[PDB]
């Protein structure tokens, strides 16, 4: 499904992402906007044989298993097809692992490029939270 901005903000807040590891809620919403345009079914194929899945475009080389990516680690221990659900819980739980790993939200290149450095609080303004 395609989420609305405040609808996603509220779902992510319910899942404990607001200020998780130092990143306020606005960061996560902006990341989803520019990674998947708020769509749970977005997928993106990469030159190394991996694919990015779901609303947060989680990658199959390191995080989920899709059965077709060469040096796959499955550090979230989840099949990638679960990340394509309309319900974002598996994506959020794997995103919690990714941001705890090493370089925070730098794992998301659309965040890195288009969110970081802006006032990301603007992405939850006007939302009932």
């Amino acid at each position: 499904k395609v989420f609305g901005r405040c609808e996603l903000a509220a779902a992510m807040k319910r899942h404990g992402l607001d200020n998780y590891r130092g990143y306020s809620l606005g960061n996560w919403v902006c990341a989803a906007k520019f990674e998947s345009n708020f769509n749970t079914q977005a997928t993106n194929r990469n030159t190394d044989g991996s694919t990015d899945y779901g609303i947060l475009q989680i990658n199959s080389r390191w995080w989920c298993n899709d059965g077709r990516t060469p040096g796959s680690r499955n550090l979230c221990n989840i099949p990638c097809s679960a990340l394509l659900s309309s319900d974002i819980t598996a994506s959020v739980n794997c995103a919690k692992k990714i941001v705890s790993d090493g370089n925070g939200m730098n794992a998301w290149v659309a965040w890195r490029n288009r969110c970081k450095g802006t006032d990301v609080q603007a992405w939850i303004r006007g939302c009932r939270l």
Side-chain angles (χ1 to χ4, degrees):
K1 55 167 284 197
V2 178
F3 274 85
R5 185 175 59 89
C6 292
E7 183 189 12
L8 186 63
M12 288 176 156
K13 188 172 181 60
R14 295 184 300 102
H15 285 103
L17 279 186
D18 190 18
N19 301 126
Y20 187 81
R21 286 293 168 122
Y23 295 97
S24 63
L25 228 213
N27 286 109
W28 295 104
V29 177
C30 183
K33 172 67 172 204
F34 290 132
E35 285 296 346
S36 67
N37 197 43
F38 303 138
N39 190 150
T40 50
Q41 291 207 33
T43 63
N44 173 61
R45 293 216 65 173
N46 301 117
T47 62
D48 67 356
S50 68
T51 300
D52 297 321
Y53 295 88
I55 190 138
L56 281 167
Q57 292 292 278
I58 286 171
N59 190 266
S60 59
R61 185 156 165 204
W62 309 109
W63 306 111
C64 58
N65 175 30
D66 67 357
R68 59 169 153 125
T69 298
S72 179
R73 286 181 172 279
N74 175 15
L75 295 167
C76 287
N77 193 44
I78 188 85
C80 299
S81 62
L83 306 188
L84 253 25
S85 180
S86 281
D87 177 305
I88 68 171
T89 303
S91 281
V92 172
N93 287 339
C94 178
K96 281 181 175 173
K97 295 192 79 293
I98 295 168
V99 75
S100 301
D101 177 76
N103 219 138
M105 285 195 69
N106 288 122
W108 288 282
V109 74
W111 179 80
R112 206 193 302 147
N113 292 333
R114 306 178 222 166
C115 298
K116 184 176 183 175
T118 66
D119 173 24
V120 291
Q121 297 129 22
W123 284 92
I124 59 159
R125 93 151 62 87
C127 296
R128 192 168 207 231
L129 257 35

